[PDB]
Every structure is written in C-alpha cells, then in structure tokens.
Amino acid sequence: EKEEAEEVVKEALKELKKLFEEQKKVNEEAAKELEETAKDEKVLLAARFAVEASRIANKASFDLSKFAADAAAAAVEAGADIERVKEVLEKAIEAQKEAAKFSKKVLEEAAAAAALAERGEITEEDVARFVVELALELLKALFEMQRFVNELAAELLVAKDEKVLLAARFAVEASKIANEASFELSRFAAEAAAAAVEAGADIERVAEVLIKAIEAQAEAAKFSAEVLLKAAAAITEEDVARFVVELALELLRALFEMQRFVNELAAELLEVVAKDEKVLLAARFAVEASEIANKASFDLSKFAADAARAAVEAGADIERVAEVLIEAIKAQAEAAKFSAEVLLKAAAAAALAERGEITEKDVARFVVELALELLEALFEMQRFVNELAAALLEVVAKDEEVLEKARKAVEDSKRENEASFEESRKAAEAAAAAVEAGADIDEVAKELIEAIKEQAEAAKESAKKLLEAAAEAALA
C-alpha cells in the first residue's frame, strides 16, 4: 500500500530525472550548432543568451517537477489515496515534457533569427528586441509552471484537522499571491529593458540584466517550494498559528528582496540610457525614492505580522489572524507593483529626454510628481495596516480598560500618520514650485529624498509605539 505508493513516487522522480537530463543533452548539443551559425558577435551574444536562458528554463522545470514529487511523497507519509497521487505525478510529468518542448522552442527562435540576421534585413535592434521579447517569454513560462505545480501541491495538502487545514490553505494562498507579485516584478525588469533597447542601449548590458531577472524567478521559485514543503512537513494550536505568522514573514521578506533586486536592475539599465547629467539625476532620484518606498512598505507589512504575532500569543484564533496576514501580503504586492510602475514611468520619461522629445524641466517636474504618488501610496498603506492592527486588537482586548488604552493608541497613530503625510505633501508641492522657478534638480531631489525618508522615519516610530500597545494588551 503506502510502501508501493512510495515506489510510484521514486519511479516518477526517476523518470523526471531522465527527462531533465535527456533534454539537457539535446539542448546542449543544439547550443554547439547554434554557435556555428553565429556569424558576427551580436548574433552569438543573442545565441549565448537563448542558450543560457533555456538552460534556466529546463533546470527550473525539473526543480518544480521534483517539488511536486516531494509533495506527493509527503502525502503518502501522512495518508494519501494512491490514485490521486498517481494523477498528480502524471500531471507533473506532462508539465516537465511541456516545459522541455518549450526550452527547445526557444532555441528554434534563436537559430531562426540568427542566420536570418546574418543573411540581412534583421537589424541589431531587432536582435536586441528578440532578446528582450524572449526574456518576457521565459518569465511567463516559469510562472505558469509554478502556478500549475503549486496547484497540484495544494490538492495534495491530509490535514484531518480544520485548524491545520486552514494553515495549509493560508500557505497555498500566500504563496500564490507572492509568486504572482514576483512574476510582475521580473516583468517590470524586462519592460524596463525593453525601453532601454528602443532608446539605443547596447544589447550586452541589456542581455546580462535580463539573465539576472530570469535567474531571480528561478531562485524565488525554489524558495517558495522549500517553504511550502516546510508547511507540508507538519502539533499545538498555537504552534500552528506561530507557523502561519513565520510563513507570512518569510514570504514578505522574499518579496521585498525581489523588489530590491529588481529595483537595482532598473538602476543599471538607467545608467546606460541616461547619458545626460541632469536626466541621470532624475533617474537616480526616482530609483532611490522607489526603493525607499519598498523598505517602508515592507516595514509596514512586517509590523502587521508582528502585530499578528502578538495576537496569537495572546490567544487569538488562527482564522482571524490568517485573514490579516493575507491582507498584509497582498498589500505589499500592491506597493511592489505600484513602485515598479512609478519606476517604469520614470525610465520612459528619461528615454524621452534622451531622444530629446522632452526637456529637463519636464523630467524634473515628472519625477517630483512621481515622488508624491509614492508618498500617497505609502500613506494609504499606513492607514491600511493601522486598520489591520486595530482589527487584531478588537479580538484580544477583552477587558474594557485594556480596550480603551488600545483604541487610544490606534487613534494616536492615525493622527501621526496623517500629520506625517501633510509634512511630506507640503515638501512635495514646495519642490514642484522650485522646478518651475528654475531650481537645479540636485537641490530639489536632495530635499525631496529627505522628506520621503522623514515619512519613513515617522512611519517606523508610529508603528513601534503601536506594536508596543498591542504587546501590553497581550500581557494582560
């Protein structure tokens, strides 16, 4: 029974291993042939990209297939109908074959556009667009495999306990929301490389940044698999809630690390594009301001999970705590996408300035109004997480004297967050009025960075005093 079920899993992983290394040898020999038809270096630079990126798609294909097998093995160890395990293993084998057929389809596009360009007609920008468009193709393909395999691993996770099943539902929900945000962050890194190619940047810098973004997806893909395999590797009702909080913190931490790595990939792509000094200062200002907003949002998401930690140690049930953590993770995903859209629009305006279509005052005006958009989105998240902390307090604060001190602390943070945005808004419309009067972007950006950091400082101190009140309410 279960021993035979463990025999089907090991043979499934055995087949997945040979499928992965048969496709490895097929693609590795298609790379030598791709080296032959690489007349001129630009074709070889694109051929080596398609080869290196296809080896990532094939390697990430097996890592996601092995995760499905390890998830199926864990199901057998803790009760499993063997026919639903065979069904999941069969679907994972088809996904490996499908991802293998795509890794070769990538090299088909490479060899086609290769000799086509050396024959003529195809310019280097079309080769540069081919590399960028291919980057989009693999990033989307890796996300679909991870979404499909995580769906299979969801069906596997066995609990036989409502509370533990609610925790498995949270792990599946939180990982799916984070994997969607990581895909959109890597997509913005590829959309930034598309604006750099159409602006005149060299494909060599664009190619290596895209490889950084492709590998970032695979590393986050395996991390999400390892945490979900920890979730399967499960008692105490409070240790289940402690797992949910620690899982929510790890995904928020990996999401910010993706926001940080992708933010730095945009700075590299702006350095090659922004050849003008004053436009480079606007690019470097928007890059830093966007990253500051990423830290502040992550600090506001970590405060929510820390407030949820103080709630589970006070005795709040897992169900309400899982809701607040779900709302916090998607709140960080909203900021991650919003901060990426702001930085994407900044790269476009810098490209317009490089082409000469807009002036430097237009770029200075644009990065200032983008700074206010980030200051508003940070303030809207401060009010959102403040509502979540007030919700968690309404469950743990039962003594009317404890509730009164807690509700007062929620109000004080509401006034502190509001007043901090007024300070950041006054400085925003002051820096905008300076741009129109002809003030140098160096001084405007310097004073706006200090305003954004001062709101981030006020947000930290407000969250510190608020988490303090929730902790004392838990002690009583």
Residue numbers in the entry: 1 to 157, 160 to 236, 245 to 486
Question: Can I see the authors' text?
Answer:
Restricting helical geometry to ideal straight helices with zero helical twist in principle considerably limits what types of structure could be built, but this is more than compensated by the great simplification of downstream material design, as illustrated below. Using X-ray crystallography and electron microscopy, we validate nanomaterial designs ranging from simple polygonal and circular oligomers that can be concentrically nested, up to large polyhedral nanocages and unbounded straight ‘train track’ assemblies with reconfigurable sizes and geometries that can be readily blueprinted.
To generate straight, linear THRs, we set Δθ to zero. This results in perfectly straight repeat proteins in which each repeat unit is translated but not rotated relative to the previous unit. We tested 33 linear THRs (with Δh = 0) with helices either about 20 or about 40 residues in height; 23 of 33 tested designs were solubly expressed, and 13 of 19 designs analysed by SEC were primarily monomeric as designed. Structural characterization of the linear building blocks by X-ray crystallography individually and/or cryogenic EM (cryo-EM) in the context of assemblies (see below) revealed that both the detailed internal structures and the overall straight linear geometry were successfully achieved.
